[PDB]
């Protein structure tokens, strides 16, 4: 009947970016201008698609991916970007079709002397493929000597903690992010809008 976007956008907890969450969305109708004309979205960028035109289109499947990153990293959530987040955590394909929605979540996801519950992957042997997810925590080998699962010189736990405090620069504050991706396949299209 109606696509459950409030379920995604208004969730209490958000995933860490390295463990980003995907909600599949099918067999429903929703107004996207509800979202575009919503409030306090500091980023609303679309690719291959216009927000207003989403009401006139039908897609086979629509995925809503959500996670939290730093403010200065929201720019990496875009086709063709590089950096720790795009390379190791959440990668959009070069020909991405969808929208990227972000908003500052400082006073929900920070803490007194720092919230250290959101993590990101700082090390990885190779870059992620688009929409790949890596939740492993194997020790990362930075030199010729193997680590054998022990942290030490050139042997690093691969995740790093976000230093989310109020009084950080706003570029360091947490932002929640939702990425909608749209796919039109041979099968019947069940996500349309009014």
């Amino acid at each position, epitope marked *: 009947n109606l696509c459950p976007f409030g379920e995604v956008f208004n969730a209490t907890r958000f995933a860490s970016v390295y463990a980003w969450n995907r909600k599949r969305i099918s067999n429903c109708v929703a107004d996207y201008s509800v979202l575009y004309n919503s409030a306090s979205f500091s980023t609303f960028k679309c690719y291959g698609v216009s927000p207003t035109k989403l009401n006139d289109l039908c897609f086979t499947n629509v995925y809503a991916d959500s996670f939290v990153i730093r403010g200065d990293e929201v720019r990496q959530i875009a086709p063709g970007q590089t950096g720790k987040i795009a390379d190791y955590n959440y990668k959009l394909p070069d020909d991405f079709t969808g929208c990227v929605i972000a908003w500052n979540s400082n006073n929900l996801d920070s803490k007194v002397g720092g919230n250290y519950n959101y993590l990101y992957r700082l090390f990885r*042997k190779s870059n992620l493929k688009p929409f790949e997810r890596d939740i492993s925590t194997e020790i990362y*080998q*930075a*030199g*010729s*000597t*193997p680590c054998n699962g022990v942290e*030490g*010189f*050139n042997c690093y736990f691969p995740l790093q903690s976000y230093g989310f405090q109020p009084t950080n620069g706003v570029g360091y504050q947490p932002y929640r992010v939702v990425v909608l991706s749209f796919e039109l396949l041979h099968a019947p299209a069940t996500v349309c809008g009014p």
Partner: single-chain antibody, 231 residues
Framework: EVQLQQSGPELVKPGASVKISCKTS????????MHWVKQSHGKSLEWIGG????????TYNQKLKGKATLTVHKSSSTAYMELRSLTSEDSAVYYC?????????????WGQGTSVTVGGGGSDIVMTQSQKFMSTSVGDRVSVTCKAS??????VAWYQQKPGQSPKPLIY???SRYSGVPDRFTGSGSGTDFTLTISNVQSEDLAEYFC?????????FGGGTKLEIKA
């Protein structure tokens, strides 16, 4: 073209301290870990420690009992080693060298060396080259053996050194050749027994040959085998 240019010789007397540099070029400095190796005159190679230049992380051979400290200067792409409380036993040639991981393992480029003149841990791996000198004839097939006191898998490298030069990397991962190394050189072995084989030995193979393990810290080297080549 990678280059590690080290600073010039030093003469000191007991109790004082030395700081030597290693200026790099030809590659992105922060992408490769730098190691330091000591060679006492006529003696074998000893690993001092390493430093990851991207984050400043470092480690040291406990044999040095804390007398070395490694630093880097990312701006000038330069690594430093400072030695303190120098004694008679610290006179040696000191090398910087680059860990080539993840492409060519172990020490794929070396500086030219810096002359400085004035038992181990129970779990340290000992690499034994039981032959110190071999004489063969041109054209022979030569086998240099190296035994590890503990299993080191295939994390073994071989180097070649001619007098007055830094070691030249020949073999890593027990059996792979570094760039530009002739096919006459092959390495074999796994576990604890390793061999370097030179097929059809030539005059330019006159050198001393060293094995090394990088399976565990401290990195350790065999004692070296000098190869003399006669007509």
């Amino acid at each position: 073209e990678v280059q590690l240019q080290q600073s010039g010789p030093e003469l000191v007397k007991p109790g004082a301290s030395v700081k030597i540099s290693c200026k790099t070029s030809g590659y992105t400095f922060t992408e490769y870990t730098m190691h330091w190796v000591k060679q006492s005159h006529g003696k074998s190679l000893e690993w001092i420690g390493g430093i990851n230049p991207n984050n400043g992380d470092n480690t040291y051979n406990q044999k040095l009992k804390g007398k070395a400290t490694l630093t880097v200067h990312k701006s000038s792409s330069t690594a430093y080693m400072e030695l303190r409380s120098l004694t008679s036993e610290d006179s040696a040639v000191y090398y910087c060298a680059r860990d080539g991981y993840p492409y060519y393992y172990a020490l794929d480029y070396w500086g030219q060396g810096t002359s400085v003149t004035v038992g181990g841990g129970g779990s340290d791996i000992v690499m034994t080259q039981s032959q110190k000198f071999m004489s063969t004839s041109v054209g022979d097939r030569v086998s240099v053996t190296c035994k590890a006191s503990q299993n080191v898998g295939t994390n073994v490298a071989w180097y070649q050194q001619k007098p007055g030069q830094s070691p030249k990397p020949l073999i890593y991962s027990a059996s792979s050749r570094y760039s530009g190394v002739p096919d006459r050189f092959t390495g074999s072995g796994s576990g604890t027994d390793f061999t370097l084989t030179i097929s059809n030995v030539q005059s330019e193979d006159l050198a001393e040959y060293f094995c090394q393990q990088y399976n565990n810290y401290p990195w350790t080297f065999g004692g070296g085998t000098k190869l003399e080549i006669k007509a």
